[model samples]
Target: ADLLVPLLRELAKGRPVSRTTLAGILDWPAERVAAVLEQATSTEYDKDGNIIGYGLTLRETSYVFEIDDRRLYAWCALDTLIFPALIGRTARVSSHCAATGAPVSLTVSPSEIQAVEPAGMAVSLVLPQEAADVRQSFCCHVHFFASVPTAEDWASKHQGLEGLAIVSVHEAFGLGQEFNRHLLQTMSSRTP
Candidate 1:
């Protein structure tokens, strides 16, 4: 999971990254890169075997994450919050409220949220679960709302989502930072 940060950084460059490139970035052997990625079902590959997407992607999703002139997409609302800290780049995120289809936008820096339009904007989150495909089980449930009331209304309309919670964008960013810290610790313990 720690390697995820560097991998995301490379993907954020808005080009398909071959395994060799990732190997160079991580300073690991090709076999090691393959080994770790083998477990990742969400990793997107091009026709020639370059990776086009991980959490950050070339493919479009609901969340638009713009960084350094590159237009990228994220799997979910939470990913938009989590990735800026992981990749050490500020992102301009744009998405619509799940219930209202109203636009919501924010600027997220590595350390904090710089600004948000519609100050009441909130993000939906769900507890992690044991699932083979996280995009469906997890990403599909997390979303951005125009406000906390909007989030609650969306959740009410949707059924069977466990552990769903709506939080302010700042709070979501804080959780993302804590998640990054945990990943750093996990990676540190696993490496060398």
Candidate 2:
């Protein structure tokens, strides 16, 4: 799972990347890399069983992840919110309000999150127990327009989301930083 940290960091670079080449860069065998990718809660693969995405499922997630060169994808709105910081790159994140279907966009850099329209913005999530679970339904992968009935929106769409908490984008950034630190540190602790 620790490998996911660097692999995702490399992915956040916004370049065209492939699982095979990624394995080469990490000096890991393709089989080992594939094993790690399969174990992730957010794992995605092509019809060939070649790894396509992890952490952020490019095909399913709501947000469209784009950079200067190629288009990418993420697991949720929060992935768009915090990925720039994790990768040490600047990026454009665009999505729609989960409730109103209004378009939302931001240019996030390592230093700041810029010009958020509909100032009423919040993240929907439950604190996950581990980095791998960040993309799981109960964790940090969902974003909702603050306009969603204020007190409860996540539950309206799904049964279990009723108790999930919502917080400002700024607060979510801090949570992401903390999670990033935990991921990086935990990854460092494992060697072999």
Candidate 3:
């Protein structure tokens, strides 16, 4: 029932809101927002009770969100592990609607939820030049070009899994080195 503040703020600016507002502002399909709101209401019931209306919740309040709404997913090709980053209090339709680094619109971190850190896009295929790092970046850039969908396609389809997310191959390799060291030290070691 505490989902009033932001909703009212939007109203104060003369922009009406509700599930519809969420869909419009976040640029999601209306049905998706309705489904999300339905879940929010059900979740509230277990947590609270018969607070079906607004407590302090005035005019279309009551909300909670999942990780997907709060975090943006981007991946790296280095190891293929998914990375996430918290970029919104709730997903905004304007995000990625343009291009480049998506703007993070939260005034403060959203509800202390752990966010998926986004790794830069994966890039494969590159000129293996004179230097190792240079070759690595080149390859990744190429992979990014090859596998990642263009912005137009991504925007139209909004398929989260439709791209090659890449991470710093060197960084992943370094972490693996740590694991290797641990394994070597523990190999067949006798308890003291």
Candidate 4:
């Protein structure tokens, strides 16, 4: 009954999932599987109550992740980087500057996140509330920009954005890992 994270890790192999199919694989009832999914990771379900996707869904922070020749989406830039660690897969993530719309990309593995730019580059991030719901309908609007200037520029376009905290993408990935650690540990212990 406690196969949530392991299932998610398998899903992260780069494809959508249907709850019925998932149940067939895990030998759990579909109803039980959905309950565990909703209670655990931020999996998205269709109107029919069938899971259509898991992992992150791109929003304000746009990215495309490629691994083993398959592509995926991550919620934010930081998620694009850290999700590889969570799923135990290395990936290539690509995004653009928020202000300038310039291209930026990275190759990330469990041990390292490397910018594709030869001279190296820094990324910007917007972290949402620590305890905010991770549902697809709710993201707290966290995002990442290609640079501090781009971040500030994007923030400036939105009124009263001063309340949000900003950090480097690297730092934000660390923060995300720390924040999600407990959730991972909890699921890991329960997963077969």
TM-score of every prediction relative to native: 0.68, 0.58, 0.18, 0.60
Please give the TM-score that candidate 2 achieves against the real structure. Answer: 0.58
lDDT of 1: 0.75
lDDT of each prediction vs. the true structure?
A: 0.75, 0.62, 0.32, 0.61
Predicted structure 2: clash tally: 0
Give RMSD to native, each candidate: 5.5, 7.0, 20.0, 6.6
Candidate 4 Cα misplacement greater than 4 A, ranges: 1-4, 14-24, 27-51, 55-62, 78-82, 118-120, 127-140, 149-159, 182-192
Kindly list the per-residue Cα lDDT of model 3 for residues 38-88, writing each as its tens digit.
666543332323122222222231121123323222222222211112233
Q: On lDDT, who's better, 2 or 3?
A: 2
Instruction: For model 3, state the Cα shift of residue 128 in Å.
Output: 57
lDDT, candidate 4, 77-100, per-residue tens: 655544566566577878776567
Tell me the lDDT of model 3 at 21.
Answer: 63
Poorest 10 consecutive residues by lDDT, candidate 4: 118-127
lDDT of 3: 0.32
For candidate 1, report its TM-score. Answer: 0.68
Runs in model 1 with CA error above 4 Å? Answer: 1-8, 16-43, 51-60, 128-136, 153-160, 185-192
Cα shift from native, residue 6, model 1 (Å): 5.4
Worst 10 residues of 1 by lDDT: 183-192
Model 4 whole-model lDDT (C-alpha atoms):
0.61
